[PDB]
Amino acid sequence: CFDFDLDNTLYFFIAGRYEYKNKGADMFIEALARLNYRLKVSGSKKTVVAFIVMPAKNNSFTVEALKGQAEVRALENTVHEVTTSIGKRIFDHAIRYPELLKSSDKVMLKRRILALRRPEGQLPPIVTHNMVDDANDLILNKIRQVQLFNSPSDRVKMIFHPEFLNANNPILGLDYDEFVRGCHLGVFPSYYEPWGYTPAECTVMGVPSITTNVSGFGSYMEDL
Amino acid sequence: SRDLQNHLLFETATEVANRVGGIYSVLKSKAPITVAQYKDHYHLIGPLNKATYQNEVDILDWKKPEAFSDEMRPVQHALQTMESRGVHFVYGRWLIEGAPKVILFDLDSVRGYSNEWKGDLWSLVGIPSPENDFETNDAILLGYTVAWFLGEVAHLDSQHAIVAHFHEWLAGVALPLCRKRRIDVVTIFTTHATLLGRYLCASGDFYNCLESVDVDHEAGRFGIYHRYCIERAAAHSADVFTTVSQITAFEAEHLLKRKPDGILPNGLNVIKFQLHALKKEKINDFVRGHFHGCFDFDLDNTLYFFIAGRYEYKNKGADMFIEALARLNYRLKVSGSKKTVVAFIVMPAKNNSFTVEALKGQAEVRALENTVHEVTTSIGKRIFDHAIRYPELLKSSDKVMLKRRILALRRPEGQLPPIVTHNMVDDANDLILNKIRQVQLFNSPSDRVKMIFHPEFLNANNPILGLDYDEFVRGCHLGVFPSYYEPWGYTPAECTVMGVPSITTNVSGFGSYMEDLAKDYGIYIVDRRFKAPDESVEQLVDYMEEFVKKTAAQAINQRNRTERLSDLLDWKRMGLEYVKARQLALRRGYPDQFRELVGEELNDSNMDALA
Amino acid sequence: EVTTSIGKRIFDHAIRYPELLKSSDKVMLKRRILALRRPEGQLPPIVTHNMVDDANDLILNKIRQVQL
Numbered sequence: 024c025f026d027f028d029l030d031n032t033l034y035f036f037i038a039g040r041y042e043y044k045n046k047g048a049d050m051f052i053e054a055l056a057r058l059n060y061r062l063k064v065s066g067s068k069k070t071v072v073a074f075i076v077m078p079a080k081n082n083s084f085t086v087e088a089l090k091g092q093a094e095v096r097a098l099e100n101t102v103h104e105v106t107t108s109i110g111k112r113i114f115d116h117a118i119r120y121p122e123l124l125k126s127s128d129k130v131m132l133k134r135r136i137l138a139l140r141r142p143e144g145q146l147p148p149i150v151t152h153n154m155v156d157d158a159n160d161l162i163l164n165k166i167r168q169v170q171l172f173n174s175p176s177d178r179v180k181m182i183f184h185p186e187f188l189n190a191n192n193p194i195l196g197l198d199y200d201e202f203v204r205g206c207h208l209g210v211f212p213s214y215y216e217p218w219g220y221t222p223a224e225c226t227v228m229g230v231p232s233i234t235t236n237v238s239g240f241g242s243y244m245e246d247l
Numbered sequence: 248s249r250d251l252q253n254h255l256l257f258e259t260a261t262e263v264a265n266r267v268g269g270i271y272s273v274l275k276s277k278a279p280i281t282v283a284q285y286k287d288h289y290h291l292i293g294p295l296n297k298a299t300y301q302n303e304v305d306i307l308d309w310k311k312p313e314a315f316s317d318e319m320r321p322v323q324h325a326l327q328t329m330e331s332r333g334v335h336f337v338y339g340r341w342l343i344e345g346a347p348k349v350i351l352f353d354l355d356s357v358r359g360y361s362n363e364w365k366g367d368l369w370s371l372v373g374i375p376s377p378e379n380d381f382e383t384n385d386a387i388l389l390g391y392t393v394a395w396f397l398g399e400v401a402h403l404d405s406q407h408a409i410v411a412h413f414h415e416w417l418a419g420v421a422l423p424l425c426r427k428r429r430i431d432v433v434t435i436f437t438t439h440a441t442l443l444g445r446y447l448c449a450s451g452d453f454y455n456c457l458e459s460v461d462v463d464h465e466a467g468r469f470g471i472y473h474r475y476c477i478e479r480a481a482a483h484s485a486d487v488f489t490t491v492s493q494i495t496a497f498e499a500e501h502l503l504k505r506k507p508d509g510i511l512p513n514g515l516n517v518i519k520f521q522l523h524a525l526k527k528e529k530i531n532d533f534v535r536g537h538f539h540g541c542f543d544f545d546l547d548n549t550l551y552f553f554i555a556g557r558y559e560y561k562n563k564g565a566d567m568f569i570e571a572l573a574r575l576n577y578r579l580k581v582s583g584s585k586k587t588v589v590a591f592i593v594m595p596a597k598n599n600s601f602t603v604e605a606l607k608g609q610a611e612v613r614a615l616e617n618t619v620h621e622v623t624t625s626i627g628k629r630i631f632d633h634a635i636r637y638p639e640l641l642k643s644s645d646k647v648m649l650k651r652r653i654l655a656l657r658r659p660e661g662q663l664p665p666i667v668t669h670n671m672v673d674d675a676n677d678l679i680l681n682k683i684r685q686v687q688l689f690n691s692p693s694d695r696v697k698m699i700f701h702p703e704f705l706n707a708n709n710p711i712l713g714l715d716y717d718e719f720v721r722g723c724h725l726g727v728f729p730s731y732y733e734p735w736g737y738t739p740a741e742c743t744v745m746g747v748p749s750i751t752t753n754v755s756g757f758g759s760y761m762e763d764l765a766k767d768y769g770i771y772i773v774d775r776r777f778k779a780p781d782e783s784v785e786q787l788v789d790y791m792e793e794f795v796k797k798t799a800a801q802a803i804n805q806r807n808r809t810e811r812l813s814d815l816l817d818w819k820r821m822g823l824e825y826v827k828a829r830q831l832a833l834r835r836g837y838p839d840q841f842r843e844l845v846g847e848e849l850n851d852s853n854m855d856a857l858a
Numbered sequence: 859e860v861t862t863s864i865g866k867r868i869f870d871h872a873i874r875y876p877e878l879l880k881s882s883d884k885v886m887l888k889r890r891i892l893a894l895r896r897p898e899g900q901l902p903p904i905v906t907h908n909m910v911d912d913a914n915d916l917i918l919n920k921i922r923q924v925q926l
């Protein structure tokens with residue numbers, strides 16, 4: 024259910040130690056729910072996918088989330104195989120001078136497309152892991168309270184990844200520094216934060232960011 | 248009078264378009280070869296699985312006049328007729344290589360006739376049917392429907408002879424009906440195992456005293472009677488009765504009480520596989536991350552052994568494997584050997600992903616690799632820039648980060664490399680861990696065979712072991728599959744196709760089959776059927792030892808030899824056994840018409856007796 | 859080649875815990891450096907090609923006239 028234009032979507036992210044109130048996770052999730060409303064009303068063309076990278080007690084990846092990446096990768100391979108077959112066929116014809124997809128290829132293509140179908144009415148998850156307390160976790164419950172559930176109607180999508188980032192992840196193959204750079208806007212709505220290295224290192228890496236005036240780094244930044 | 252020459256093929260099994268068994272694999276990989284031969288005369292039939300069919304089946308409109316050649320009309324009208332009476336089904340292509348046409352009956356649209364049918368069955372074949380057994384309810388439903396559909400085809404089609412193949416007891420209720428109603432189709436029943444075989448071996452003796460067990464009583468003892476009756480009825484009603492393996496055929500003869508007319512060994516789509524150095528290196532990379540902080544052996548002088556597959560401790564022969572390795576340890580310490588064997592058990596178990604310990608391992612060893620690289624390329628630039636300008640290279644800076652990365656490898660005194668890569672959800676009761684404890688293979692440097700249990704299938708995206716299973720297999724030196732109950736054994740056979748030496752048994756179907764075609768070819772066969780439990784084990788250790796003491800050139804000899812065996816196992820050769828089977832079914836069905844087509848009268852007691 | 863040898867040597871030492879250039883390497887290094895020496899007082903050319911008219915070409919003759 025991939026219904027939006029990646030050439031027209033922005034990636035927002037909040038990250039760091041899991042302090043719900045103090046890092047300002049609450050405000051973040053809440054403000055996003057509101058940015059959803061405004062973008063449906065303003066009938067906007069764009070899409071915001073927003074990551075919460077904050078470590079929580081977990082049991083590694085959800086079977087759902089892993090199948091996701093797997094099938095989509097197998098699509099990539101099969102497409103590639105198929106295209107390079109077309110390549111050889113197209114070239115070999117030209118060099119000799121004086122439907123390019125055989126049945127064979129149509130089949131394994133059709134199969135890889137069918138594997139993407141997801142069980143009717145099942146939406147993209149809001150969490151990438153097996154949460155060890157799915158009922159009491161502050162972050163999930165707030166993103167439920169605001170009903171950001173990733174239905175196609177929703178213009179801001181919600182991804183909670185309760186685990187630091189490592190390039191070797193089945194799901195998201197980046198280190199944290201890699202990931203930060205690949206995003207569009209860091210958001211760190213902190214309430215108690217004597218300095219805040221997350222936003223400051225966000226800035227050093229050349230990414231736009233939102234902090235507060237109760238953040239140390241905010242405080243400092245304000246005077247420039 | 249019908250055309251034996253150009254005939255119709257309907258292969259029926261529970262698995263058609265849904266992985267539930269291993270038969271799925273058999274049929275899926277046999278499709279390409281049989282579609283090639285029979286084109287659109289060939290249909291697979293099975294129960295529709297409303298949960299998965301949409302991922303595996305190109306649904307087709309079977310009503311368009313275009314859907315069938317004119318000579319194939321009958322089948323269309325047959326379905327037409329079937330719809331009339333209110334039977335629902337999916338016509339479609341099964342999206343595999345081959346893309347064979349598939350008929351998937353909707354068992355719900357017929358679940359009404361259930362009581363009437365359970366009855367009719369009892370009073371034609373005396374097959375009991377408790378109502379709490381859903382598999383047999385479905386097996387009966389499927390049976391009556393398919394028999395029905397063949398009734399119709401045999402009725403409407405008058406040009407082609409009709410052969411109908413059924414795999415395993417669940418798809419086997421149709422068989423009695425066909426013989427009873429004297430429907431005009433010749434029938435083949437293949438069994439990929441027996442019911443009693445499985446149930447007897449599930450406790451821990453068989454191949455000896457199996458020729459002398461009271462079938463009717465043991466089937467009872469297990470609460471299996473009605474299932475057993477179907478499997479038996481299936482085997483006697485069929486015109487041709489077969490099994491996948493020589494070994495299973497002996498089991499079948501005494502347990503179902505009919506001698507198989509032939510064997511239908513499972514081949515593979517060999518092209519779908521076809522390096523070793525390239526992949527061995529990925530395994531080296533894992534072994535270094537794992538034994539970090541006490542890496543005391545020469546990788547240029549270590550061999551990788553592996554057992555893999557479904558987690559059946561007794562039947563896959565995990566026990567013998569671990570045990571025999573403990574013994575291969577002894578022998579290698581005494582014989583004071585220079586070499587090291589690291590042995591993987593890739594068998595899926597209940598787990599909580601990776602152990603912190605095991606993940607730190609790979610992480611720190613990777614950070615070493617980076618730092619070394621960064622450092623060396625710095626030396627590079629420095630060396631070059633000096634030369635190009637003409638007329639301790641490690642600065643302090645580099646020494647520091649080098650020293651730190653080396654220090655991170657130190658492991659807490661007396662802590663050994665783990666025997667398991669995952670968080671086991673039952674560390675105390677798991678059969679594999681407890682056996683590798685009982686034998687005290689704990690990976691101390693004294694130990695010459697190291698033990699790695701990886702309770703999880705292999706995927707290239709693993710933090711620990713960055714291979715797919717095919718990649719991993721190739722990177723190893725010897726597969727070891729000491730199986731005790733194993734009607735075929737795809738794990739060893741695909742091991743061989745990939746050009747890796749392997750050890751199987753003579754109670755393995757694949758073993759059984761392989762025996763008839765010695766060890767120089769990369770296939771060792773342990774005798775598990777005649778020698779006693781212990782001599783078996785010992786024979787195993789002798790085989791491993793011999794392998795360890797092979798020279799660099801002796802090993803490259805074997806490997807090159809097994810690699811040529813591969814083409815023997817493709818369907819292109821193994822498929823010919825199915826042709827023998829189908830044609831024996833015809834020769835038995837139309838003894839007269841067959842004589843005309845051949846020019847004489849050929850023997851009809853085996854499939855080998857025929858050709 | 860030489861550096862990646864150093865690489866392997868440095869790493870293998872560390873992984874096992876508990877002048878990196880052998881003679882072998884010094885030699886082929888020394889030889890490659892010596893091959894750069896150019897015949898005394900011979901300067902870097904002002905032209906990369908074999909000119910079919912080295913005497914009349916406008917471009918060469920101007921860059922001679924200015925003695926670059």
Ligand SMILES: O=c1ccn([C@@H]2O[C@H](COP(=O)(O)OP(=O)(O)O)[C@@H](O)[C@H]2O)c(=O)[nH]1
Nearest residue numbers: 038039040076186187188199219220221222
């Ligand atoms: O996936 C991640 C996310 C966090 N970080 C690091 O972990 C620290 C956690 O941020 P925290 O909020 O605790 O720092 P603060 O901003 O409060 O100083 C950051 O400095 C990041 O450099 C990381 O290494 N990987």
Ligand SMILES: O=c1ccn([C@@H]2O[C@H](COP(=O)(O)OP(=O)(O)O)[C@@H](O)[C@H]2O)c(=O)[nH]1
Nearest residue numbers: 269555556557703704705716735736737738
């Ligand atoms: O990590 C793994 C381990 C095994 N397999 C596959 O699983 C099968 C295991 O065979 P199984 O034991 O289930 O059946 P049998 O050995 O009796 O044929 C092999 O065919 C492999 O192709 C896999 O894909 N990934």
